[PDB]
Amino acid sequence: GREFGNLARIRHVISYSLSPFEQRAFPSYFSKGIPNVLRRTRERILRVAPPFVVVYLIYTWGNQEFEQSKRKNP
Amino acid sequence: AAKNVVSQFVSSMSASADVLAMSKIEIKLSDIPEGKNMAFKWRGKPLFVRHRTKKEIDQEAAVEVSQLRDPQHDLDRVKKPEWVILIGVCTHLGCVPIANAGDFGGYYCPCHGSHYDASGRIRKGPAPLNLEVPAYEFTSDDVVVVG
């Protein structure tokens, strides 16, 4: 059914692979990892962050308004 | 990590600390005079400790194994013959025996009419077997450990 052997139909594609026993598991870890982390967060930060920024704003304003409301009126 | 977590889970099902405090309850003193049977609440059972003299032990040494109701001679069950340790539980109904009574001067069951032997055997009565003797280890003679 959904086993290997009849999943799709691919023609004219060549793939090259190495052994895991003769290539490094951490090939240029920091020197190529830090720029891709900055690239990924630069691609996603303007979609993710400002809702949580306004969450922090509402949280602080609600705490301040609650402590003001418990405070009496001289 | 696997050995530690499996050993902790197995050791959780072992006897807990309240059970350990309620299993080696009685650490006896020597506040028992020569000849007196006294009672303890050990493991939910009456435990009898009585001092004995060698005159009565030699008198009870003439009880043969062949004519016993349940064969158990009066020489091997105690390492110290002057101190005797019994369980005060009837095998017939679950009553308490009272010592130094009868023609033999043994234990007597007031529920029942049965006269136990002073060593703990059923001398006369319809109790099918004797009074059981627990396990006990010997420190210095002021202190005996039961368990």
């Binding site: 004219h12 594609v13 060549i14 793939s15 090259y16 692979s17 190495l18 052994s19 895991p20 290539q23 490094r24 598991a25 951490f26 090939p27 418990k70 405070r71 | 990590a1 600390a17 309240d18 405090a21 309620m22 309850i25 009672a39 308490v96």
Partner: protein
């Protein structure tokens, strides 16, 4: 008063992640509880055998339990009878029932102190601030007689008379029994009473942290090996045109 003062953070000896309790302070706090706090408060869930190996030795806790009468029973004649205590006995209740405790304490019920730093927001900080925060009532508010003003009690009206002052008891090890020292010792003992597993938990957590810091890069390295067969893979295309 609806607004409530919060207790501050005190720099406890066991405040840190790997710092255990101070067992000498547990011993002194148990002495404080036995001499002072056991008159009105109960610790039904803690026994005398729990003190062995923490702050007292075997014969010490045996004597400290033997100096307590425990109502054993029923007797063979069918009655209750007083007996000297033993190591398997729990701490004795001050009252046989909560309503007698209410009758002896002006209606208010003194709570059981086995979990009282696990049941309050602040914990031992709250207990220290309650015991050391007694003061005369401010103006405007005039509270009822037999009540006491405590700004850390919620509602600021406690039915407990202040039990702590300088030299309320003695210390066998030679410590100045001041107000703050006694309150700190009894707060340490209450933290031990709520969590008897605290030091063993922190030791097991230290072993957990070291073992996980060893195990995570190695398992990550295994993942990077068995996936680095795929992450260096290159694909090509050969269209026939």
């Amino acid at each position: 008063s609806d607004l409530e003062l919060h207790p501050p953070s005190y720099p406890w000896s066991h405040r840190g992640l790997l710092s255990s309790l101070d067992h000498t302070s547990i011993r002194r706090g148990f002495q404080v509880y036995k001499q002072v706090c056991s008159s009105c408060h109960s610790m039904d869930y803690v026994a005398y055998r729990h003190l062995v190996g923490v702050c007292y030795t075997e014969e010490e806790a045996k004597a400290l339990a033997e100096e307590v009468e425990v109502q054993d029973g029923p007797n063979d004649d069918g009655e209750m009878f007083m007996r000297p205590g033993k190591l398997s006995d729990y701490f004795p209740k001050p009252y046989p029932n909560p309503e007698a405790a209410r009758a002896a304490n002006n209606g208010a019920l003194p709570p059981d102190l086995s979990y009282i730093v696990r049941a309050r927001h602040g914990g031992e900080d709250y207990v220290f601030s309650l015991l050391t925060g007694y003061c005369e009532p401010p103006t405007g508010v005039s509270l009822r007689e037999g009540l006491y003003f405590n700004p850390y009690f919620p509602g600021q009206a406690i039915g407990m008379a202040p039990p702590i002052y300088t030299e309320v008891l003695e210390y066998d090890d030679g410590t100045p029994a001041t107000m703050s020292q006694v309150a700190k010792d009894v707060a340490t003992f209450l933290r031990w009473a709520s969590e008897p597993e605290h030091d063993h938990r922190k030791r097991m957590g230290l072993k957990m942290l070291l073992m996980m810091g060893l195990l995570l890069p190695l398992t990550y390295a295994m993942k990077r090996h068995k996936w680095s067969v795929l992450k260096s893979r290159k694909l090509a295309y050969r269209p026939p045109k």
